[PDB]
Amino acid sequence: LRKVLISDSLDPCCRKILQDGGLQVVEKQNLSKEELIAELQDCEGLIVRSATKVTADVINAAEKLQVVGRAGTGVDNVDLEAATRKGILVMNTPNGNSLSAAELTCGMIMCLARQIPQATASMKDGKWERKKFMGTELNGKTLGILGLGRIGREVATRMQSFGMKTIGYDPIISPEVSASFGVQQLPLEEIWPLCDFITVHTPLLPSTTGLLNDNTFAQCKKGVRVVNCARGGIVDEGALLRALQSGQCAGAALDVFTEEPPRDRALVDHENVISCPHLGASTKEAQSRCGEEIAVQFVDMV
Amino acid sequence: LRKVLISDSLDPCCRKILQDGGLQVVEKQNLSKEELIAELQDCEGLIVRSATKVTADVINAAEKLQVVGRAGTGVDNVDLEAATRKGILVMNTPNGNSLSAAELTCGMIMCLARQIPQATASMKDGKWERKKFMGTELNGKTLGILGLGRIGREVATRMQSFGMKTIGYDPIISPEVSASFGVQQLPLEEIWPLCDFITVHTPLLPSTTGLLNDNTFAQCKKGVRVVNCARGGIVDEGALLRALQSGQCAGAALDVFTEEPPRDRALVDHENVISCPHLGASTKEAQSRCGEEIAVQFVDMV
Ligand SMILES: COC(=O)C[C@](O)(CCCC(C)(C)O)C(=O)O[C@@H]1C(OC)=C[C@]23CCCN2CCc2cc4c(cc2[C@H]13)OCO4
Ligand SMILES: COC(=O)C[C@](O)(CCCC(C)(C)O)C(=O)O[C@@H]1C(OC)=C[C@]23CCCN2CCc2cc4c(cc2[C@H]13)OCO4
């Protein structure tokens, strides 16, 4: 039985089910550079959240090893050429967060539709302006969804109920299967001029790094509103800021950013932009089930 | 009757349909309190919504007018007893807002869940507070809709897509027709202990003035989250203000108020409270979509 690290915030259900096979770990990560000489030197695995941006060296500094794995979304903190030193894989939990990012993005569609945070943020500033925050309805406006995996198909089944026409594009996914979850499929060329909203749930990829750039925004007709609760970057943040600045983008909702604590501050400060600190998988719920699924697909191989 | 005024901001959507059914009218709004008796001592009809409410007596000093009309749910601007017994009665717009208030309410449910405005206001203040807004899922949580009808049944079907078990209570509305949009019906007695969220759009009535008070709060779950996008009062603003304090109601979303611009500011400021200045009905989809009906039930009199 080898014993590992809770190298980040994770619901203690995680550790209890992690151990009732024979395998615990220490209750912390409050740290950063020079106290993480402690969790080094031993261990075989690691169980994080991601605030543990494991450096180029601190996966090679625990050379007691074979694999690691984190409860949630991707790994936005591991250089894995600098991760896979010997026999490494990293297990992730791509199914557990599936439902709650869908919840987050539909909430962001509705806010993009109305401007709910802007209106209360200055109501709390003490102002009764029943004239500036006049929104648009969702039913009958046209939504476009790029990529169509778990999350997007859940976003879509949730949002065609509001009366929205759902189109999209996934290269692999048949037009037949998109139709069989009510999202029409297109080549991107026509997906732009047809849309009142655009959300994406695309992974960060070269095909998709900045897959909404100055051209796509030049093809969507005026005032479209982009939501991004996927990976930071899939919307060209400068190009997005430009479309925002003049009329091409009525508003935009952004859960992720190219630089994760974004030190670029032009977008969030913008009037038509609504924000969140990567709350995509942030429910007591979602972290519960990804901690379980990591700590079972971990505690039962080898 | 073939002379009219819209004493309010009006999408000419109304006036155009008004005209060749047989009725000419003038385009002002800006108006004082006691001066549209000049504009309306020589014409007969009137269409208001909010601005410069039709008084109790601007029925007694405008010795012409005989029918009136409001773009919106209910009438929060006409003294209806001082209308009825001089032989004036009111056509209003009960159909236009149902869909855009239903949508707004579902947005406010989502924000209560995942704290989208609360998270954005500190993104805009430049703080990455990724653990204060660890929200809740909708899927599996149990929703309550007090009073059903237009907005209630549309909120119910819209919110069933998220996986919520949605119950409610309307006395008139059939238990058999209760089901026809998937809301079970129970008396409040049992609907309290059952709820993670509760929505309201019930009319203002002594039957319902302060229908959520310190008593109701003593029976539902704890940390329950209520939205009220109906009339100001149906939730006791003082009683709710206290409920927040105890964790008995974790969060709350309010579109309307007992006052108007409330000189009371205790609730609006609460970190776990989200707001908007009566935006329930404010998209010109819906607003002009009311402009159609008011000036057709006018031109379906002549
Ligand atoms: C551009 O090519 C694609 O979009 C196909 C693909 O998006 C990606 C293939 C699956 C993996 C993640 C293994 O690459 C997919 O099938 O789903 C991914 C998938 O596995 C099904 C995981 C992802 C990535 C972020 C969100 N999420 C869950 C499912 C989902 C839903 C989406 C979405 C992406 C995802 C991915 O955009 C449209 O709505
Ligand atoms: C306390 O008992 C009730 O709630 C009954 C009643 O809410 C009002 C009875 C219907 C009338 C207005 C004709 O009395 C109703 O049936 O709906 C009203 C109704 O007719 C269906 C008109 C209303 C009034 C304001 C909003 N709107 C649309 C429908 C609706 C939806 C609701 C709601 C109220 C309304 C009303 O509570 C939460 O979900």
mmCIF file of N, CA, C and O in Angstrom, chain A residues 114 134-137 141, chain B residues 9-16 49 96-97 100 281-292:
data_model
loop_
_atom_site.group_PDB
_atom_site.id
_atom_site.type_symbol
_atom_site.label_atom_id
_atom_site.label_comp_id
_atom_site.label_asym_id
_atom_site.label_seq_id
_atom_site.Cartn_x
_atom_site.Cartn_y
_atom_site.Cartn_z
ATOM 1 N N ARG A 114 -29.841 38.634 -20.756
ATOM 2 C CA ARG A 114 -30.238 39.821 -20.033
ATOM 3 C C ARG A 114 -29.360 40.980 -19.395
ATOM 4 O O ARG A 114 -29.594 42.187 -19.457
ATOM 5 N N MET A 134 -32.139 46.723 -20.950
ATOM 6 C CA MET A 134 -33.216 46.107 -21.735
ATOM 7 C C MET A 134 -32.726 44.927 -22.588
ATOM 8 O O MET A 134 -32.155 45.132 -23.669
ATOM 9 N N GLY A 135 -33.035 43.692 -22.165
ATOM 10 C CA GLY A 135 -32.455 42.506 -22.767
ATOM 11 C C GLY A 135 -33.182 41.997 -24.007
ATOM 12 O O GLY A 135 -34.019 42.675 -24.603
ATOM 13 N N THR A 136 -32.799 40.786 -24.428
ATOM 14 C CA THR A 136 -33.378 40.098 -25.575
ATOM 15 C C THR A 136 -33.867 38.727 -25.115
ATOM 16 O O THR A 136 -33.289 38.123 -24.209
ATOM 17 N N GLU A 137 -34.918 38.214 -25.753
ATOM 18 C CA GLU A 137 -35.432 36.904 -25.386
ATOM 19 C C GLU A 137 -34.589 35.803 -26.001
ATOM 20 O O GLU A 137 -33.892 36.001 -26.999
ATOM 21 N N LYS A 141 -34.245 32.965 -30.904
ATOM 22 C CA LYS A 141 -32.901 33.377 -31.270
ATOM 23 C C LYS A 141 -32.077 32.127 -31.523
ATOM 24 O O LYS A 141 -32.434 31.024 -31.096
ATOM 25 N N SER B 9 -43.303 55.628 -22.935
ATOM 26 C CA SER B 9 -42.376 55.175 -23.948
ATOM 27 C C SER B 9 -43.037 54.045 -24.717
ATOM 28 O O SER B 9 -43.521 53.074 -24.126
ATOM 29 N N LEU B 10 -43.054 54.158 -26.042
ATOM 30 C CA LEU B 10 -43.841 53.222 -26.823
ATOM 31 C C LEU B 10 -43.164 52.934 -28.142
ATOM 32 O O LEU B 10 -42.837 53.856 -28.894
ATOM 33 N N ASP B 11 -42.938 51.656 -28.397
ATOM 34 C CA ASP B 11 -42.531 51.215 -29.710
ATOM 35 C C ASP B 11 -43.673 51.518 -30.666
ATOM 36 O O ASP B 11 -44.772 50.968 -30.486
ATOM 37 N N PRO B 12 -43.469 52.342 -31.688
ATOM 38 C CA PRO B 12 -44.558 52.636 -32.630
ATOM 39 C C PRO B 12 -45.232 51.383 -33.183
ATOM 40 O O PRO B 12 -46.240 51.491 -33.879
ATOM 41 N N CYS B 13 -44.642 50.200 -32.955
ATOM 42 C CA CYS B 13 -45.322 48.907 -33.096
ATOM 43 C C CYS B 13 -46.801 48.965 -32.732
ATOM 44 O O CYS B 13 -47.653 48.394 -33.428
ATOM 45 N N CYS B 14 -47.093 49.568 -31.578
ATOM 46 C CA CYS B 14 -48.463 49.869 -31.163
ATOM 47 C C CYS B 14 -49.168 50.811 -32.140
ATOM 48 O O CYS B 14 -50.207 50.463 -32.714
ATOM 49 N N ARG B 15 -48.618 52.021 -32.329
ATOM 50 C CA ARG B 15 -49.340 53.079 -33.037
ATOM 51 C C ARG B 15 -49.671 52.686 -34.476
ATOM 52 O O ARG B 15 -50.756 53.010 -34.980
ATOM 53 N N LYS B 16 -48.774 51.947 -35.137
ATOM 54 C CA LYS B 16 -49.011 51.579 -36.527
ATOM 55 C C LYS B 16 -50.212 50.655 -36.650
ATOM 56 O O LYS B 16 -51.087 50.875 -37.492
ATOM 57 N N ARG B 49 -47.760 52.363 -19.437
ATOM 58 C CA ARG B 49 -47.176 51.137 -18.909
ATOM 59 C C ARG B 49 -46.659 51.286 -17.487
ATOM 60 O O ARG B 49 -46.999 50.492 -16.604
ATOM 61 N N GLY B 96 -48.082 38.912 -23.044
ATOM 62 C CA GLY B 96 -46.832 39.249 -23.699
ATOM 63 C C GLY B 96 -45.591 38.925 -22.884
ATOM 64 O O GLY B 96 -44.563 38.532 -23.450
ATOM 65 N N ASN B 97 -45.657 39.091 -21.551
ATOM 66 C CA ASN B 97 -44.475 38.963 -20.698
ATOM 67 C C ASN B 97 -44.190 37.547 -20.203
ATOM 68 O O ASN B 97 -43.054 37.278 -19.788
ATOM 69 N N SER B 100 -40.839 36.072 -21.301
ATOM 70 C CA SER B 100 -39.578 36.762 -20.997
ATOM 71 C C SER B 100 -39.361 36.936 -19.495
ATOM 72 O O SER B 100 -38.213 36.958 -19.028
ATOM 73 N N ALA B 281 -39.906 41.985 -17.509
ATOM 74 C CA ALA B 281 -40.649 42.091 -18.763
ATOM 75 C C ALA B 281 -39.961 42.948 -19.834
ATOM 76 O O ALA B 281 -40.631 43.414 -20.766
ATOM 77 N N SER B 282 -38.645 43.173 -19.741
ATOM 78 C CA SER B 282 -38.046 44.209 -20.569
ATOM 79 C C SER B 282 -37.194 43.687 -21.728
ATOM 80 O O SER B 282 -35.975 43.912 -21.756
ATOM 81 N N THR B 283 -37.803 42.995 -22.688
ATOM 82 C CA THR B 283 -37.230 42.893 -24.013
ATOM 83 C C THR B 283 -38.272 43.365 -25.005
ATOM 84 O O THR B 283 -39.464 43.053 -24.870
ATOM 85 N N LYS B 284 -37.831 44.122 -26.013
ATOM 86 C CA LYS B 284 -38.835 44.614 -26.931
ATOM 87 C C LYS B 284 -39.393 43.523 -27.816
ATOM 88 O O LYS B 284 -40.435 43.763 -28.439
ATOM 89 N N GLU B 285 -38.733 42.359 -27.914
ATOM 90 C CA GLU B 285 -39.513 41.199 -28.314
ATOM 91 C C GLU B 285 -40.790 41.204 -27.500
ATOM 92 O O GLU B 285 -41.859 41.520 -28.016
ATOM 93 N N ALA B 286 -40.670 40.996 -26.189
ATOM 94 C CA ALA B 286 -41.857 40.915 -25.341
ATOM 95 C C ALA B 286 -42.580 42.258 -25.261
ATOM 96 O O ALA B 286 -43.810 42.308 -25.346
ATOM 97 N N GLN B 287 -41.840 43.362 -25.155
ATOM 98 C CA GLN B 287 -42.504 44.638 -24.924
ATOM 99 C C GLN B 287 -43.366 45.074 -26.106
ATOM 100 O O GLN B 287 -44.557 45.377 -25.946
ATOM 101 N N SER B 288 -42.816 45.060 -27.318
ATOM 102 C CA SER B 288 -43.670 45.310 -28.481
ATOM 103 C C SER B 288 -44.587 44.140 -28.758
ATOM 104 O O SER B 288 -45.583 44.279 -29.484
ATOM 105 N N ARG B 289 -44.277 42.992 -28.175
ATOM 106 C CA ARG B 289 -45.103 41.852 -28.454
ATOM 107 C C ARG B 289 -46.386 42.008 -27.661
ATOM 108 O O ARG B 289 -47.325 41.259 -27.883
ATOM 109 N N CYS B 290 -46.346 42.917 -26.670
ATOM 110 C CA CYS B 290 -47.472 43.497 -25.930
ATOM 111 C C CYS B 290 -48.076 44.708 -26.628
ATOM 112 O O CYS B 290 -49.280 44.972 -26.495
ATOM 113 N N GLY B 291 -47.231 45.480 -27.312
ATOM 114 C CA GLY B 291 -47.728 46.581 -28.124
ATOM 115 C C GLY B 291 -48.717 46.116 -29.175
ATOM 116 O O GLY B 291 -49.650 46.841 -29.532
ATOM 117 N N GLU B 292 -48.488 44.928 -29.726
ATOM 118 C CA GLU B 292 -49.470 44.329 -30.628
ATOM 119 C C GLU B 292 -50.819 44.154 -29.932
ATOM 120 O O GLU B 292 -51.851 44.656 -30.401
#
